[PDB]
Amino acid sequence: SSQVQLVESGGGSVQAGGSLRLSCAASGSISSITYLGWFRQAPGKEREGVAALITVNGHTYYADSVKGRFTVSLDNAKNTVYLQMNSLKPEDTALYYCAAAAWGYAWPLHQDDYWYWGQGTQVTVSA
Amino acid sequence: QVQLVESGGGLVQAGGSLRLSCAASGFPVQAREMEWYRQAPGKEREWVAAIKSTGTYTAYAYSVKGRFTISRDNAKNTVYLQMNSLKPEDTAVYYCYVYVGSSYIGQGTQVTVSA
Amino acid sequence: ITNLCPFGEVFNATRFASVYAWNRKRISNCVADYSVLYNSASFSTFKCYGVSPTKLNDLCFTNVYADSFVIRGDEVRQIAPGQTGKIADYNYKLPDDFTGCVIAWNSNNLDSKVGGNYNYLYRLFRKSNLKPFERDISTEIYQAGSTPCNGVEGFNCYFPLQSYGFQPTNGVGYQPYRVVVLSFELLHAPATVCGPK
């Protein structure tokens, strides 16, 4: 629904070893947001969790594949959550979604929980 | 109606290999977790392995990890259990299992490993 | 009120129940601090239904129930209203109108063992689905064929329980997780479990 609105930006094409920074701006019922997740999906594959942040305390979770390379962070003033993606590799190529939840937190991420979803931003990493 | 049919068992020497198959009907194998159990007469049923397409995709019992590999062919709607380095303690009836609104388990296939 | 609620006895219990024999502890006449649990570093799941998790300390209930058990990580999502699967259907069932929270954490370093831990069990076979908050600890032989079993495990006569065989080198979805379900009960009696102040 439209209670929480998420707009992503920052995706694009980069060579292996480069970096990107995804942004996700939240509006609407923002005080209800308990949890922010970054998912990614390549066509035909699972929409998998990449990273997550608990809004009450800023605690973060990361998938094993991106630990040490990705960082998720929140600017409360701008109500914007960020995914800094360093040392990118072709395996990171996917459509990346920002998602917001109000029911608490759950790691690993599962898309079948009730989420508010951004529109998705493509990341394409070339060898 | 859901059905599972195990094939591939037989008599093998220790150190040998066997490829078991589980032919599924009534549901897509890629849409459900599917599992292998095994049981020898007078012994407790033992969980062997699992495969699915979300979260952790495969898993194995401690004593078969590194020797067995579970896989899936969507087009043939079949799950396979490749068993290498077989030992006499692997002798058992092997059963394929799925939960689709209720529990389904096949008739099984006999595996016997001589020393 | 007066004394804080004994949540430590639930979350820090050394032994946890098998899911088929899930444990329930009633909590009443105490001050409940849910925020200190929610804000901690302790849990990988803290998901609520019918209440906002960040305002739990603002609420008052007649009783609280704390159910606890161990399941696989990728089974934690069956501990929710409206779910199906062998856990939700044969082991522990939440009602559609559940009001409460489900809390879980990875317990691989406690409940898995080199060689496999066989102590934790789940029900694999049952004639029908559990009612919400029902418990079934029977070990009657399950008659899968036309021939009666007369209490003997054997051909088409299944022992209904199954060991998880938790072992530490599988991925987290097949590792053991400890689960605490907090049910918030509001009757037509005064509340005895409120947040602080």
Author numbering:
A (entry chain C): -1 to 125
B (entry chain B): 1 to 115
C (entry chain A): 332 to 528
Recite the paper's sentences.
The virus exploits its trimeric spike (S) glycoprotein to adsorb to the host cell-surface receptor, angiotensin-converting enzyme 2 (ACE2), resulting in proteolytic processing and conformational changes required for membrane fusion and cell entry. Here, we take advantage of available sequences of five SARS-CoV-2 RBD–directed sybodies: Sb14, Sb15, Sb16, Sb45, and Sb68 (previously designated Sb#14, Sb#15, Sb#16, Sb#45, and Sb#68, respectively). These sybodies effectively inhibit the ACE2–RBD interaction and neutralize viral infectivity, and a bispecific construct, consisting of Sb15 linked to Sb68, blocked ACE2 binding and neutralized both pseudotyped and infectious SARS-CoV-2 viruses. Each of the sybodies represents an immunoglobulin variable-type fold consisting of two β-sheets packed as a β-barrel linked by a disulfide bond.
By exploring the conditions using mixtures of two or three sybodies and the RBD, we obtained crystals and solved the structures of ternary complexes consisting of Sb45–RBD–Sb68 at 2.6 Å resolution and Sb14–RBD–Sb68 at 1.7 Å resolution. The refined models revealed that while Sb14 and Sb45 interact with the ACE2 interface of the RBD, Sb68 binds the RBD at a distinct site. Similarly, Sb14, which interacts via distinct sybody residues with the RBD at the ACE2 site (see description below), still permits Sb68 to bind to its epitope as seen in the Sb45–RBD–Sb68 structure. In contrast with Sb16 and Sb45, Sb14, despite interacting with a large surface area of the RBD, uses both CDR2 and CDR3 on the same side and exploits many non-CDR residues, particularly sheets of β-strand as its binding surface. The X-ray structures indicate that although Sb14 and Sb16 are of the same group, Sb14 interacts with the RBD primarily through non-CDR residues, whereas Sb16 binds through CDR1, CDR2, and CDR3. We also observed direct interactions of Sb14 and Sb68 in the Sb14–RBD–Sb68 X-ray crystal structure. Sb14, however, reveals clashes when the Sb14–RBD complex is superposed on trimeric S in any down position. Sb14 binding was most affected by K417N.
